[PDB]
């Protein structure tokens, strides 16, 4: 899990925010594997990742990367999308398959917190006061 990085375990404030020890990260262990591969290999594009192994202390994943400036990639129309600038660091924006799972998006009644594209998008829409010209 995620231990809160507070000195001596002292979260100053109200008791509801005193938790230090049984807190959990919002993103999966697979997402942080993709994020660490992308940060090191800045010139590459994270495509996807999968599980390979597991220990009591470590989890092992394998990440697929695409060199977006190789001619075999940007001469093939079926893979020219990864070369577009809007697909830089998908792993850091939660656009890979592992990253999307933590965002809580989908279709139907289980997913209404992200009914406008994201949690922040939905929050902003229902927390903005519409003042028309004719009120």
């Amino acid at each position: 899990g995620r231990k809160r990085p507070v000195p001596k375990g002292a979260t100053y404030g109200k008791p509801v925010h005193h938790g230090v020890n049984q807190l959990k990260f919002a993103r999966s262990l697979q997402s942080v594997a993709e994020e660490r591969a992308g940060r090191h290999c800045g010139a590459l594009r994270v495509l996807n990742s999968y599980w390979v192994g597991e220990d009591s202390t470590y989890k092992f994943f394998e990440v697929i990367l695409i060199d977006p400036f190789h001619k075999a990639i940007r001469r093939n129309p079926d893979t020219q999308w990864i070369t577009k600038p809007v697909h830089k660091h998908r792993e850091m924006r939660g656009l890979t398959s592992a990253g999307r799972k933590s965002r809580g998006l989908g279709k139907g009644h289980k997913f209404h917190h992200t009914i406008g594209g994201s949690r922040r998008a939905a929050w902003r829409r229902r927390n903005t006061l519409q003042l028309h010209r004719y009120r």
């Binding site: 003042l131 010209r133 004719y134 009120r135």
Partner: protein
């Protein structure tokens, strides 16, 4: 001062049509038109109609 002050007013369509009818009726009375300072003399007919 804030931009979301109410700047605009909506009037009922029937009342807006009422105001136009009243304005048209008054425009045909020479006393009311002269009371606006519109120098209507030597004008042959106040409801002036030209081809």
């Amino acid at each position: 001062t804030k931009t979301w002050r109410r700047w605009h007013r909506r009037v009922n369509t029937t009342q807006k049509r009422y105001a136009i009818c009243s304005a048209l009726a008054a425009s045909a009375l020479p006393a009311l038109v002269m009371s606006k300072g519109h120098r209507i003399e030597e004008v042959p007919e106040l409801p002036l109609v030209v081809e």
